[PDB]
Write a protein that binds this ligand. Structure first.
Ligand SMILES: Nc1nc2c(ncn2[C@@H]2O[C@H](COP(=O)(O)O)[C@@H](O)[C@H]2O)c(=O)[nH]1
Length: 359
């Protein structure tokens, strides 16, 4: 492209300098990046969304965001709190009579949401592939740790929280999310189930062997890791987490997702969101998002006292996402890739970009 005008956005060189080495190094087919600064959204797009169509990534491209979905699930849950349909200290079996008689008689909704129920695993056992088998699994589950004592990052945990939260509101999760929560968040290009009308915008994910893949149906996938969104919509969510929204209940729910419950090292666990004192060292940010924190059980420590950075990683077999933002500084970043590349790479690059945005 020698002789073409270079893009005019003065933030382009900052983003490029961090993102282009990322795409080359881990051979990422496409990434949509969106950045907030001084009340304005800046979109930077790289590569291709679908190798069959050759279509370039844009801020309208739909990516799987994996566990970033948990921030939306948690917001739905907080929304049920605000509406009075549940409290975080409710026993889980209050909201599901099929749970009465089990350990979930003594486990709170809050503990489900914050992966501190007592050692629920990261994933369902593979044989748990139906709603009936799911119910059986929960009723027979044996607590490993006492409730509240340990964080074990778990899809069955926040998955069940999302599920009972929607049950408290007398609506199935996916319609509730798409019809009430997401439109209130201004997220009109975000889906649990991507409709016919929007499929052409849906990227393919790409495995380590460069095979085109999309997320597999699994139990409570909708609740735990099943959202598809664009970088523009996700930046609207960042903005909603900073400036707020017009729906009064949704506004409260957003604030509730920021409230800390406990900490692990420098990370403080909120509802969905994980938070850090800002400015935050790269090492601290990497530690909070490390294999140790993600994969193994960690003891719960006292939460950080209520400036702050909020963040969440998301991954599926073919996608890698990350979002971080600092409300006190009006800055944020959304990075959505159609390849599941290392979390450490995501944090380092976001780290770097946010630091230059902070000025
Ligand atoms: N070893 C292992 N890693 C997982 C499993 N599920 C997700 N991960 C990884 O854990 C990290 C965090 O997931 P995320 O929070 O980004 O969805 C990602 O690197 C993701 O690929 C799993 O079942 N086993």
């Amino acid at each position: 492209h020698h002789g073409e005008a270079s893009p005019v956005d003065p933030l382009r060189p900052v983003v490029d300098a961090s993102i282009q080495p990322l795409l080359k190094e881990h051979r990422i087919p496409g990434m949509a990046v969106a950045v907030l600064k001084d009340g304005k959204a800046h979109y930077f797009n790289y590569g291709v969304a679908n190798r069959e169509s050759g279509a370039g990534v844009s801020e309208q491209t739909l990516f799987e965001i994996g566990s970033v979905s948990k921030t939306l699930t948690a917001t739905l849950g907080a929304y049920a709190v605000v509406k009075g349909a549940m409290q975080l200290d409710d026993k889980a079996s209050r909201h599901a009579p099929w749970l009465k008689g089990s350990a979930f008689d003594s486990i709170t909704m809050g503990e489900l949401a914050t992966y501190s129920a007592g050692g629920l695993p990261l994933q369902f056992p593979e044989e748990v592939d139906s709603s009936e088998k799911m119910r059986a699994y929960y009723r027979q589950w044996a607590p490993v740790y006492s409730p509240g004592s340990h964080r074990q990052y778990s899809n069955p945990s926040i998955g069940l929280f999302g599920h009972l939260a929607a049950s408290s509101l007398k609506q199935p999760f996916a319609p509730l999310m798409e019809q009430t929560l997401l439109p209130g968040l201004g997220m009109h290009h975000t889906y649990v189930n991507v409709p016919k009308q929007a499929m052409a915008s849906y990227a393919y994910g790409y495995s380590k062997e460069d095979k085109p893949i999309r997320v597999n149906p699994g139990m409570l996938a909708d609740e735990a890791y099943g959202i598809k969104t664009s970088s523009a919509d996700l930046l609207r969510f960042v903005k909603a987490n900073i400036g707020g929204v017009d729906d009064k209940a949704l506004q409260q729910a957003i604030s509730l997702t920021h409230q800390g419950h406990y900490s692990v090292g420098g990370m403080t666990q909120g509802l969905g969101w994980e938070s850090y004192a800002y400015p935050v060292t790269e090492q601290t940010l990497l530690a909070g998002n490390s294999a140790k924190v993600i994969l193994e059980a960690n003891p719960t420590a006292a939460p950080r006292e209520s400036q702050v950075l909020f963040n969440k990683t998301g991954s599926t077999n073919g996608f890698g996402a990350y979002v971080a933002f600092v409300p006190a500084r009006g800055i944020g970043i959304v990075m959505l890739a159609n390849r599941n590349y290392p979390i450490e790479a995501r944090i380092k690059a976001a780290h770097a970009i946010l630091a230059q945005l902070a000025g």
